[PDB]
């Protein structure tokens, strides 16, 4: 018998073209251009999932540095005093406390200073 | 300029006509191949 | 001499920004009331600047 998968072959293309909506020019709807662009984007996402953890830790440290400096202490000396005192609060929590609850942050500083 | 096809009806039939095809064995061999193919035009004698 | 690339839709449409049909300079005829081109004889009535110019049968 003769087997041609017309409907199935065309359905594979149509599913991916829903994912390329919003692109510039021919990159959104022309099949070989769009599929090329979509595949390159997936490679970025794998790399950018890792860099997310780097960027958010760098932002926590910067906010902690500004909050500590308003209480006469740099980030490096404040962190050295916390680790010396056994405090295990992580940088995400401290940065949140630095920004939105400045009175609780001041109690952590007053415990090691 | 002068081109390759300069028509002459007397020359055409002498060279390719029905009576010249039938005069030799190889000409009749051509007529048999064209009949077996079902050609509507057998020789230049038909288009006239 | 030769295009290195086909132009995208955007580039072609940006060039065509300055492709506009020119509007006629129209005026109303004080006699007929019809539109006519300013500084020309009204083709309906035949008048021009308040005077008959082309007496039309």
């Amino acid at each position: 018998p003769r087997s041609v998968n017309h409907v199935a072959s065309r359905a594979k293309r149509k599913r991916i073209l829903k994912l390329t909506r919003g692109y510039f020019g021919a990159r959104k709807n022309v099949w070989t251009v769009a599929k090329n662009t979509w595949e390159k984007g997936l490679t970025y996402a794998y790399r950018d999932r890792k860099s997310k953890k780097r960027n958010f830790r760098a932002l926590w440290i910067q906010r902690i540095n500004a909050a500590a400096r308003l209480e006469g202490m740099s980030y490096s000396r404040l962190m050295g005093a916390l680790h010396a005192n056994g405090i295990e609060i992580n940088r995400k929590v401290l940065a949140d406390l630095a920004m939105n609850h400045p009175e609780a942050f001041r109690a952590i500083v007053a415990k090691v200073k | 300029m002068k081109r390759t096809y300069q028509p002459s009806n007397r020359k055409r039939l002498n060279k390719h006509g029905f009576r010249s095809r039938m005069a030799t064995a190889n000409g009749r061999r051509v007529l048999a191949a064209r009949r077996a193919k079902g050609r509507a035009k057998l020789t230049v004698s038909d288009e006239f | 001499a030769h295009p290195k690339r086909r132009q995208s839709k955007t580039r072609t449409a940006k060039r065509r920004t300055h492709d506009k049909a020119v509007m006629p300079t129209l005026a109303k005829c004080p006699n007929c009331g019809a539109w006519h081109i300013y500084h020309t004889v009204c083709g309906d009535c035949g008048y021009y600047r308040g005077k008959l110019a082309i007496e039309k049968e």
Partner: protein, 127 residues
Amino acid sequence: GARKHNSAEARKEALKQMYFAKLRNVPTSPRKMRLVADMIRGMEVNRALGVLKFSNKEASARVEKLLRSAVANWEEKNERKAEEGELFVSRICVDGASTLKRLRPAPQGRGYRIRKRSNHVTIYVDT
């Protein structure tokens, strides 16, 4: 089984409130015709007729006679002669129709294709 009859009944009831006219298979290029449609879009009909009558583009004469039809369709579906200053061109669009292919000889035995294009024009009017 009455499904397509019920879909079509609603389609016809809506068409009673739409006033429009169509030009189909006009034997001129759609891009040049579009130049004229941009000129009269959203403009009072009495002023547009004079604008089309004295236009320097050749496509305007065809469009002028289609606007007259659109106004007449409006009066048929509303049962009164239209006033002056009342109607206006609420919508107009030009779409490319089917193309007629032809041949034009070129030097050294080559031949090129000529496209003789067509277009459709649709006009809506509104009070």
